[PDB]
Each structure stands twice: as C-alpha cells, then as structure tokens.
Design a protein around this ligand. Structure first.
Ligand SMILES: *C(=O)[C@H](CC=C)[C@H]1CCC[C@@H]1O
Length: 241
C-alpha cells in the first residue's frame, strides 16, 4: 500500500498472506480473505497451477511467527471459469482456494463478511485497502500489515476517458485516484474493506490492477474485482468442492 499506515495488530482478522514455495523459501506473493473455515478468496491472477501454495493467517508481521498465527497448506485451486489472463481488463479476476484442513476461529483469525448480491457502493464511499504490498511503486515491501484509506470512485466517473476509460467494467470497483493512496504490487488478491450501514466490516473488492504509470496515480484509481458480483459463484464452489 502506498501512502498508508501500519494497521493495528490483528484488526483485520480475515486478511491472509498467500505464499508460494520459492526454492525452499516461503515467499509472499498475494493477499487474500478468509471467507469460510476452509476457503480463501483471492485474485485469479495470483494463481499459477505450477506453484505450490500455503496461506498464512492471524498474522501482523510477515517475518515473525507470532503466537496464534497459522500456516495452512492449500489443496485445491478454483479460478473463475471466465477469467482470461491475457485480458485482465475484462474482469472476472477471482479465485477460491481450499485449505488442507479447516481453521479454527479465534480472536486473530476470523471470517470476512461478504456484501449482499448486487450491492453497489456510491461515489466517495469510505473504504480501506489492506496488505503487505509495496510502499511505493517499485519500492519497498513492509513487514507489518499496512492499511490505507481509499474512497470509492463510481462507474460513471471511473469510466471517463480521463480516468480508466473503457478499461473498466461494471464487474469492477474503482477506489482512490487522488495519487496519494493506492494499492500496489503484492496487495493483489487482498480486501477492499468497507463498513456497511450497520457498523459491520465487509469485503467488497479484491485487489486486481493499477496503472502502468504507477501504483499511486492521479485519476488512476486502484481497481478491484467487485465481490457482490460473484456471491452466487462463491457459494457454488463451496457447495461443490
Ligand atoms: C498486485 O499486487 C498487483 C496489482 C496491485 C495494484 C498485480 C499487478 C501485476 C502483478 C501483481 O500481481
């Protein structure tokens, strides 16, 4: 996250680290959200069928084995069937990962709540992106979970040709776009968290893409997969695997 700050420890208890095996080291590559005791939600672009995956849960520092943090092997990968890696701007950038065994819920490890089907956030809605990605474009990755505040930019604005133009579809969410705060490489797959009308935190987006001009860029909002578009698919995959 560029332009953000350290999260409070364990305050985003659904946030996952998605890691792969790199030459006998476990290496962070994407974020994710725990969405059921057996399933993590993430971005399809984070998945290669050739890598091997584990998920780390209940974490704050990526390098410290903190008490009550947990690594679990990932055993099944389910990418959205309409995802095309060669057409990232079509959307459908979504994947569900099955854990080898269910996690027990705790104070540090909780489920992230999804919005109703079809829910659209209005312009300037307040949300927060979280992750262990880069702190600036091509710069450092933190050890500690960051968060950053991002306001929703609605479709009508974000599709303008000064913004993303036609890169952006109604199956995505735009947030940010001031050039101060953004997601960045390494935040991919993790949550856009927005608090619903009754206090509750919900995960509305999955970090998908930013601009080749830079992670933080005026009138290039960070783009997210819109979770309220796949509620039905998420539940089918879970019932059927
Ligand atoms: C994820 O962190 C990145 C988007 C965030 C702004 C992805 C861009 C391509 C590589 C990475 O997976």
């Amino acid at each position: 996250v560029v332009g953000g700050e350290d999260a409070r420890p364990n305050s985003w208890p659904w946030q996952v680290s998605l890691q792969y095996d790199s030459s006998g080291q476990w290496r962070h590559t994407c974020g994710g959200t725990l969405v059921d005791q057996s399933w993590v939600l993430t971005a399809a672009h984070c998945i290669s069928s050739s890598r091997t995956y584990r998920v780390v849960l209940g974490r704050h520092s990526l390098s410290t084995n903190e008490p009550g943090s947990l690594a679990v092997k990932v055993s099944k990968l389910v990418v959205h069937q309409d995802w095309n890696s060669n057409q990232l701007s079509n959307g459908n950038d979504i994947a569900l990962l099955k854990l080898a065994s269910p996690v027990s819920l705790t104070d540090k490890i909780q489920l992230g709540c999804l919005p109703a089907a079809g829910t659209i956030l209005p312009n300037n809605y307040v949300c927060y992106v979280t992750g262990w990605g880069r702190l600036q474009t091509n710069g450092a990755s933190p050890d500690i979970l960051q968060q950053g505040q991002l306001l929703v930019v609605d479709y009508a604005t974000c599709s303008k040709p000064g913004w993303w133009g036609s890169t952006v579809k109604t199956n995505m969410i735009c947030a940010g776009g001031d050039g101060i705060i953004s997601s960045c490489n390494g935040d991919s797959g993790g949550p856009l968290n927005c608090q619903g009308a009754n206090g509750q935190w919900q995960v509305h987006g999955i970090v998908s893409f930013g601009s080749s001009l830079g992670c933080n860029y005026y009138h290039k909002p960070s783009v997210f997969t819109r979770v309220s578009n796949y509620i039905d698919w998420i539940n089918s995959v879970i019932a059927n695997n």
